[PDB]
Amino acid sequence: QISVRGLAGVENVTELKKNFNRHLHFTLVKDRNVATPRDYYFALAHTVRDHLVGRWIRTQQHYYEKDPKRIYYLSLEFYMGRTLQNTMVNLALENACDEATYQLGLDMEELEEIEEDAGLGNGGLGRLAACFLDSMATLGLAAYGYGIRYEFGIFNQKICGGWQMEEADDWLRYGNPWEKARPEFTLPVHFYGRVEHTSQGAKWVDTQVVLAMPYDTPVPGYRNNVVNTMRLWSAKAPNDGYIQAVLDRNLAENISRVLYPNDNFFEGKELRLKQEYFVVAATLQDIIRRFKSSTNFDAFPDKVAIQLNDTHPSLAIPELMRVLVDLERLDWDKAWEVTVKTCAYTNHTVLPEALERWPVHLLETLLPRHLQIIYEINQRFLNRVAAAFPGDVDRLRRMSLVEEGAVKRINMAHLCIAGSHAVNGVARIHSEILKKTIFKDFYELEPHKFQNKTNGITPRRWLVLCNPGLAEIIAERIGEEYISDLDQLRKLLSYVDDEAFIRDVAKVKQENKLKFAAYLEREYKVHINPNSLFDVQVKRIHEYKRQLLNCLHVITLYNRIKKEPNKFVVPRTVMIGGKAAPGYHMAKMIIKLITAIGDVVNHDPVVGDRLRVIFLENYRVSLAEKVIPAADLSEQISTAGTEASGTGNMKFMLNGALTIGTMDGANVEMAEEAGEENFFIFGMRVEDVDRLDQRGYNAQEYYDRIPELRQIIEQLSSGFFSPKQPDLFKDIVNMLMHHDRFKVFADYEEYVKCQERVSALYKNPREWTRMVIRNIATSGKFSSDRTIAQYAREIWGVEPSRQRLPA
Amino acid sequence: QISVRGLAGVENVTELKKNFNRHLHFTLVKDRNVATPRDYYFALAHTVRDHLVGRWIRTQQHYYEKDPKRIYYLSLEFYMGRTLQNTMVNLALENACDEATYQLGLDMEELEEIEEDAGLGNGGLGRLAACFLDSMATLGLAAYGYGIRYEFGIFNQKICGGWQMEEADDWLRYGNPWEKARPEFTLPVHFYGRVEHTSQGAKWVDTQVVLAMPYDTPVPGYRNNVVNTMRLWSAKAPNDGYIQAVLDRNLAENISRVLYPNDNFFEGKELRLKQEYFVVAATLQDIIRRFKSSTNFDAFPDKVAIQLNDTHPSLAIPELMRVLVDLERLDWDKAWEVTVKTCAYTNHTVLPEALERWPVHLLETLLPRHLQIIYEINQRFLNRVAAAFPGDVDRLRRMSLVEEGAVKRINMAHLCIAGSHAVNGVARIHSEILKKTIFKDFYELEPHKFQNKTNGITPRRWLVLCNPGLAEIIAERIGEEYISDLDQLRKLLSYVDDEAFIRDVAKVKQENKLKFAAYLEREYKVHINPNSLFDVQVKRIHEYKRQLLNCLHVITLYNRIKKEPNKFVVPRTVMIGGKAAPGYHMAKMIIKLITAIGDVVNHDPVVGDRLRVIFLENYRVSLAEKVIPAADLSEQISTAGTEASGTGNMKFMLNGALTIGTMDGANVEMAEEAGEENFFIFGMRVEDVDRLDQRGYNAQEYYDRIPELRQIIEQLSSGFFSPKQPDLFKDIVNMLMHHDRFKVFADYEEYVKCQERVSALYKNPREWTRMVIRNIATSGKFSSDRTIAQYAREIWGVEPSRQRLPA
Numbered sequence A, B: 001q002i003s004v005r006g007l008a009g010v011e012n013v014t015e016l017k018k019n020f021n022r023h024l025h026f027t028l029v030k031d032r033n034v035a036t037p038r039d040y041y042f043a044l045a046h047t048v049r050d051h052l053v054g055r056w057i058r059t060q061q062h063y064y065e066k067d068p069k070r071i072y073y074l075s076l077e078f079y080m081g082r083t084l085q086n087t088m089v090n091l092a093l094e095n096a097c098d099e100a101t102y103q104l105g106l107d108m109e110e111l112e113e114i115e116e117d118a119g120l121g122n123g124g125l126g127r128l129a130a131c132f133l134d135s136m137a138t139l140g141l142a143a144y145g146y147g148i149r150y151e152f153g154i155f156n157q158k159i160c161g162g163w164q165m166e167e168a169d170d171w172l173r174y175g176n177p178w179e180k181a182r183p184e185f186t187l188p189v190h191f192y193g194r195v196e197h198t199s200q201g202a203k204w205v206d207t208q209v210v211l212a213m214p215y216d217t218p219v220p221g222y223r224n225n226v227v228n229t230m231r232l233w234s235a236k237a238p239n240d241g242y243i244q245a246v247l248d249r250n251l252a253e254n255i256s257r258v259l260y261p262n263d264n265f266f267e268g269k270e271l272r273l274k275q276e277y278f279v280v281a282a283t284l285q286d287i288i289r290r291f292k293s294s295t296n297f298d299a300f301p302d303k304v305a306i307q308l309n310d311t312h313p314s315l316a317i318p319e320l321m322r323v324l325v326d327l328e329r330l331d332w333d334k335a336w337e338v339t340v341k342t343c344a345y346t347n348h349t350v351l352p353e354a355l356e357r358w359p360v361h362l363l364e365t366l367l368p369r370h371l372q373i374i375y376e377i378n379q380r381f382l383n384r385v386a387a388a389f390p391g392d393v394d395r396l397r398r399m400s401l402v403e404e405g406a407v408k409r410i411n412m413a414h415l416c417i418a419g420s421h422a423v424n425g426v427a428r429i430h431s432e433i434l435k436k437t438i439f440k441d442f443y444e445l446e447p448h449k450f451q452n453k454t455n456g457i458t459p460r461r462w463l464v465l466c467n468p469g470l471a472e473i474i475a476e477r478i479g480e481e482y483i484s485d486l487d488q489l490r491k492l493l494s495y496v497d498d499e500a501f502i503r504d505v506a507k508v509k510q511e512n513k514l515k516f517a518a519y520l521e522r523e524y525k526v527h528i529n530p531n532s533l534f535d536v537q538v539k540r541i542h543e544y545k546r547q548l549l550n551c552l553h554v555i556t557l558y559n560r561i562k563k564e565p566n567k568f569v570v571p572r573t574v575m576i577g578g579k580a581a582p583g584y585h586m587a588k589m590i591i592k593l594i595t596a597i598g599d600v601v602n603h604d605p606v607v608g609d610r611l612r613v614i615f616l617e618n619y620r621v622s623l624a625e626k627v628i629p630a631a632d633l634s635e636q637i638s639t640a641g642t643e644a645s646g647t648g649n650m651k652f653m654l655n656g657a658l659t660i661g662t663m664d665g666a667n668v669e670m671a672e673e674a675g676e677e678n679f680f681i682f683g684m685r686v687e688d689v690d691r692l693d694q695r696g697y698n699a700q701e702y703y704d705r706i707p708e709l710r711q712i713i714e715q716l717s718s719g720f721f722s723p724k725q726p727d728l729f730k731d732i733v734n735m736l737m738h739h740d741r742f743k744v745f746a747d748y749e750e751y752v753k754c755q756e757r758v759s760a761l762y763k764n765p766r767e768w769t770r771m772v773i774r775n776i777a778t779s780g781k782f783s784s785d786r787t788i789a790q791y792a793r794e795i796w797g798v799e800p801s802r803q804r805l806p807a
């Protein structure tokens, strides 16, 4: 069908079909009379996986032959989504398989819908890992992601009476045709025990052993025949009344059972710390073994790079020491030079509540040697500090890896800064904030460590895969080179005044909308109007992301309609979606509000189809690939200073949505790239937020000076949105009036004005789309290939390579 | 190489090798430089499984086409062992694969050794199930085995200081290439709840749901292209703070976790009852669904047969009623006619302690409706009894399905007899005992129900697979027809006086011995003498099987050697092996004795290599295939009246070992078949045991009249066999002297005399072997093909068929 999807050569289409049949018959053990579409999906997944493998064995060979420096990306989260269509695209099988499956009388897109998402992540941090892998492969880096094979991923969200219900994501139920179990490289991981000092030094003894069994999943580059590995560990109890002893094997395997579902919130539970050590321990042995097939650890950092994805794998640092000091018998000072030279750290937040500070008493019981190492590290660090700022006892207390208070904690961030050679933020404003505020002391000590790597996203999933109609019309004008050189989208800038291109851009957006409205009725019986502006905010539910502010705009548009029913307004479909962590009471109330506004607004006959408020259930990677292509307005409205970067924002820029946002995180760089003219920016800057905080935020003030806002609150307090429980939302109203750490009212007024300008521009189709053209054409910087190239050069010290490996 | 193993056609050997390579590469994702012998094993297992599948899909089709009566074999146990070599043999690939793997530079027998046993059974009962499946397939019956897919099978036994240690059998660790997971036919099973009576009858409500997910394993007939199914259920929790709620999913999945390891002993634990209901519930729905693709349940028994393997699946009877009465709305009397006509029951013991008597309070809590059904059944049964024996209130109390006492029990056996149309014992003497003693009342009521089906074993595993050298020399003389017509071995009777055949039989036995002695040194550094008589007793450790009596003979041979060191004795290697249930204190002591005798006898320099006592670790199917071919003397020495049939005994008859045994179980029929002349029979008959019991067994008497025995006991009491714990065996001595339910001393004297005659015959090689010839040639009756044909005709009402299905 479309050009970007590759060749359907008579040759390939014939070989693909017999492999489909071979798999249906031998692998699936079904015949054409009993096969369900699920069996067809699998037969196709095994058929396409067949093409990866030869390439997979050859890449892993090459790396043995050539022995390059290896990159290890440690993350507790890899939010991968579906793999089928991704693999077809990176391999150029898409048009062939489409031919093949058509000739067999199947619709491929119907089959693609059967694949479960691999939801082994919560949001932005886990998905960044996922994009980063795609980019490492595409750029020919010798790179492995290590994490955990959770048997249950982020829960599936159900709405029952406008409340979230959580059910288990049982993604493995039907098998994972992408992974290959690797029981022959199972390794032991150790817990508890106690430390023994001998003549020959410390020994960690009487430990409980959990085995770590790896699963490998292929990660293919874009058309370069590189296939890298994602290795995930699973927990296995070792083989050493009887009935009970067997059932208790489960206690050890609970380690890899389930992903902790809290995003941007630290809970200091033990099970979590065990998961953190588990991946760190199994991975470092795998790393050192690979190194040992090159006594001499001086070359370790020329051969190994370890990237810490937030502080989740921070124990990699004392564990690397433990191994080097206790088992390999290097001397401390040398072990410490190898460590610092090996590891580097990426910070993803400045929210106090998001930072890991583990209680000393947990680490003592569970990891007694590692606590000893951490005290040694801290002591020698403080002596460097003391030596550089003589007599500054305050600095010593602040910078310490050990926090005093009613329970001592280890501040995991302080450990990563100390034991890493580079520390980076994830957008320019974010990294400045780091240097100016929370890591100020560490910056003054070691300025050379601090860097910036503005996040990106992969153009393969986020354009080519989910917006083939747009990738197509872009490719008719400028070729295909851009899919791995997103900087080339600038060439589109000279098309801004082209009547044909304008109409094609708008046409594609219109088609995407028509598809999405149809998915909405088919799968959830919800009846939108595809001619409205699609105003969407999708992301995890959090006070800092300010969904509430979005709510207050919505209620406003609706109060203004009721006040003058016969006046013309631009119609909108407001779409909000995201999961709330199960214990996060406020976030769960916010979901309830959104649907409650829906029950009122969606059934007012005066409103017409001028305004609909939809709550999108189960927001996830695969739902993102559907709603992002179909959006007109992208909501990125966090309080200045709190959203480290955002990546949702980039997905939307790239797919012809316009952005309304605060000067936060990567928003600052996006508007910088497209020009502030072509962006809808509003509200406080970081500086204004600080001015507010010194003086004191008092929300009453806004309540008294803004009648529109006063009215909304009165409707919230009195039950206008909850007739059978008049007091339902007193927590929200109360938090808004007295305890709002994120200043929703302070941006209310500016946000509503900005929103009127969005409507204004929307009324002139031609001018909306040229502004679109202008964003799409400047989104190049936000490719993860750009981010990874910076990591590669400025941190890991390896050269990217776009060169093909032989077929 | 050998003739019986099939053709190595240039054609097949070429196609097999490329499939080996295709699997190594695509399925295993390995290349020829990293592959371990384990990868080679797997590549071959998938290559051979490929040939099963087309045949598998075609058999299941045929049954749809032709709609025959279906046989359901319900067992909690299927002791299958290895599958590779079995599949090659039933399919005729053995010589080809042997060629193929040789040309690739691999030794196939080395690969075969890597396959884990599927130890989903304890001993005779689980293995009978396994042989029966092979025979149903070979005889073209439309037959399914249903059971449970235990994640851990019978524990692996380790010996540490001559004590048993149990470790988990983690048989799934590396994957099972034989099964095919079938998540699309997952079914719900219900527990707990409570019963509600309406106008419309009873409803079982507020239940806990466990899902049952099936796994299918292929069961191929011998060269007839029939491939039947073994379906095993696995436990799955359904999908409906949060962390804990997820981990607790394990509680529901513990149902299929592990096989209860007690053989011939009832433990009334809840987990066990849940397993019993689980398989019964999931299976009956699968059965009724299959029936529903033929309102009208009158044809149910013409279409369905359910075989109960002991009382383990006895709930099939009230569950069949529950479904028919409560859900299908048949009236009671009609539902009861369908049930009785559908089910039949096989009893495997008369030991009181082995019978299931489930406490009422367990069944009330867990299965409240089924208890109501059982009371209804019992009431109407007692009214039939009352009506036939007016005023016999004693009979009423004895025959009741409900046993009174400090805790009420349901006697599961009484339920099976009542709700089945046939009840059978597993050897002729066993079925007589049934009719004369424990089921006497039920016999007087319904004589037409009681039958006999003497057990058999499959000649494919138990001759062709484990004794190719013997199968070979048998086949040079009489052809190959005998492998599925074991009755043809009689033709060997006219070879008893053939000097060439004599020497071939003896030669094969000698080779088998040489192999086994070499396996003994290689895998366990134990140094036997292959010229000795191989005296073996292998089977589970139980007081009734009288390993102790074997011990006392051993100690005797050794005391006689010490008394006259310079006299000539026939050398022996005594080999005893078997697992003891983990809580069975006495059985664990017996293992300790055996090794203790080993520490003394094996290191007396006077004994020489005249006597060695070996304890064989980890007795299992795959160890049986090795030691049975290599044995000269088969020990089958249970107290008359206690071993229901035995099947170990038949394995040995068929493999040229001679039997020393009591007149017990199938021994009576074996000696009947070969002639008492050609069998070494000794000890009490059942009648003598009863004479003893009336008078009173008093073991002191034997102690006083037999100085040899007195001496053995004195050595046991005083620490001769345990120098550092003089009191170690006081439990054994004490049990022997005062509390022996199995009369070891009463057979001592007769057993030792009989043993001297075995030695005598052993000294004349020529006469030993002709006696061998005589046993092998009469073993025909003991084929499971004979047993299954009887089941088929006399119970299930279907015609066996030896006819091939098209290739």
Ligand SMILES: O=c1[nH]c(=O)n([C@@H]2O[C@H](CO)[C@@H](O)[C@H](O)[C@H]2O)cc1Br
Pocket (backbone or CB within 6 Å): A122, A123, A124, A125, A126, A128, A262, A263, A264, A265, A310, A348, A349, A354, A426, A455, A643, A644, A645, A646, A647, A665
């Ligand atoms: O727990 C977390 N979860 C998460 O999604 N992020 C996100 O990390 C993404 C990747 O860096 C960023 O774009 C977002 O600004 C940031 O919130 C950070 C933490 Br810390």
Ligand SMILES: O=c1[nH]c(=O)n([C@@H]2O[C@H](CO)[C@@H](O)[C@H](O)[C@H]2O)cc1Br
Pocket (backbone or CB within 6 Å): B122, B123, B124, B125, B126, B128, B262, B263, B264, B265, B310, B348, B349, B354, B426, B455, B643, B644, B645, B646, B647, B665
């Ligand atoms: O729990 C049991 N385990 C077992 O192996 N059998 C055996 O059943 C075999 C199969 O019928 C028979 O040959 C043996 O005599 C009998 O002991 C019976 C019970 Br009941």
